[PDB]
Amino acid sequence: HKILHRLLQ
Amino acid sequence: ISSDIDQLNPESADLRALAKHLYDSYIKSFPLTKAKARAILTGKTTDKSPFVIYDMNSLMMGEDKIKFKHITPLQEQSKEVAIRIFQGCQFRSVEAVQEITEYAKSIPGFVNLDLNDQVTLLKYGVHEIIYTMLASLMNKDGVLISEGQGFMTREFLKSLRKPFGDFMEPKFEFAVKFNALELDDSDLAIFIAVIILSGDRPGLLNVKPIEDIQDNLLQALELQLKLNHPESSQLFAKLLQKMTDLRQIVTEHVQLLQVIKKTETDMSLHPLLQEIYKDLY
Ligand SMILES: */C(=C(/C#N)C(=O)N[C@@H]1CCC[C@@H]1OCc1cccc(CNC(=O)c2ccc(CN3CCN(C)CC3)cc2)c1)C(C)(C)C
């Protein structure tokens, strides 16, 4: 789930 | 106990502020409003009309001669008709996620949740939200594409080869019923928020804080619909049931993407869509 939590930053 | 007996619902003034706050994010966050999309579709606009794709001749004239802001991946332009069209859809989906995620930050106390919870919420939410927003771009005839520049017929899409012919009909089926509710961008703003904040999402560590926000938003939405659509009673109810149909579209969507993963080596799913579909239903 790496790309998502990038965008949540 | 006088404090304890404040089991009552928050004041409307606070909710309307929440409604307005959400709306602004929505306007800022997204490229195409329903209000805008409707202008084009009903023809009430001096904006350049959109190019109608109803067959191959139309499609080829579009690809060849018409200028489009949204295009099929350049690499993918070599491909079969049914692949290209869909690859272009796939690309616009990628952007929608970014836009949607930006919007979710705006929701009061989204970031104040656990990121394992908070990332899960988006994983399941986005497609439900995409299908909800797509319906603003649809009618019974077809769908607006590339920021209103093209319009592509429902029947053309059904004339494509299996399994792509049947791909979009269930969205059309939904979009005509959803659009019958006659919602607008100010209603949609809150409703999108309601979709994301669900305690039914699988693998959620802290349901209680989420359920509390959703309750906040359901209260906000209920009032917004009361204020905005006096004619239709139980619109709140009727609207909440559409969440069912959204789910069903999304599950069927993934189940057809299984076929695509097995059926063609040359349809390549984007790394992000792949991430979201990985371990999903
Ligand atoms: C689009 C669907 C298909 N197949 C489709 O909607 N697919 C996905 C379902 C769930 C996510 C995807 O939709 C993402 C999306 C978000 C916002 C807006 C749209 C509307 N579609 C487009 O704007 C669009 C853009 C480019 C192209 C490619 N074409 C450009 C014009 N000429 C050159 C032909 C190729 C298509 C659509 C989608 C279709 C039913 C339209 C195939």
Author numbering:
A (entry chain B): 687 to 695
B (entry chain A): 197 to 477
Task: Quote the passages of the study that discuss this structure, keeping the authors' original sentences.
While most other rationally designed covalent ligands of PPARγ contain the nitroarene moiety that links the ligands to PPARγ irreversibly, SB1495 is the first compound that contains the cyanoacrylamide moiety, which allows the reversible covalent bond formation to PPARγ. Crystals of SB1495-bound PPARγ LBD belonged to the orthorhombic space group P212121 with the unit cell parameters a = 62.4 Å, b = 62.5 Å, c = 162.2 Å and contained two monomers in an asymmetric unit, whereas crystals of SB1494-bound PPARγ LBD belonged to the orthorhombic space group P21212 with the unit cell parameters a = 131.2 Å, b = 53.3 Å, c = 53.8 Å and contained one monomer in an asymmetric unit. The structures confirmed that both SB1495 and SB1494 form covalent bonds as a predicted mechanism, with strong electron densities connecting Cys285 to the electrophilic β-carbon of the cyanoacrylamide moiety. SB1495 forms a hydrogen bond with the backbone nitrogen of Ser342 on strand β3 with a distance of 2.7 Å. We found that the moiety from cyanoacrylamide to cyclopentane of SB1495 extends from the pivotal Cys285 towards the C-terminus of helix H3 and then turns to the N-terminus of helix H3. SB1495 occupied the Arm3 region of the LBP near the alternate binding site of PPARγ LBD. The piperazine moiety of SB1495 directly pushed helix H2′, resulting in a significant shift in helix H2′ compared with the SB1494-bound structure. In addition, a hydrogen bond formed between Glu259 on helix H2′ and Arg280 on helix H3 due to the shift in helix H2′. To our surprise, the Ω loop of SB1495-bound PPARγ LBD structure was reasonably well-defined by the electron density and residues 271–274 (Gln-Glu-Gln-Ser) in the Ω loop formed a helix. The binding of SB1495 to PPARγ LBD induces a stable conformation of helix H2′, the Ω loop, and the four-stranded β-sheet, which may interfere with the binding of PPARγ to Cdk5 and thus affect the Cdk5-mediated phosphorylation of PPARγ.
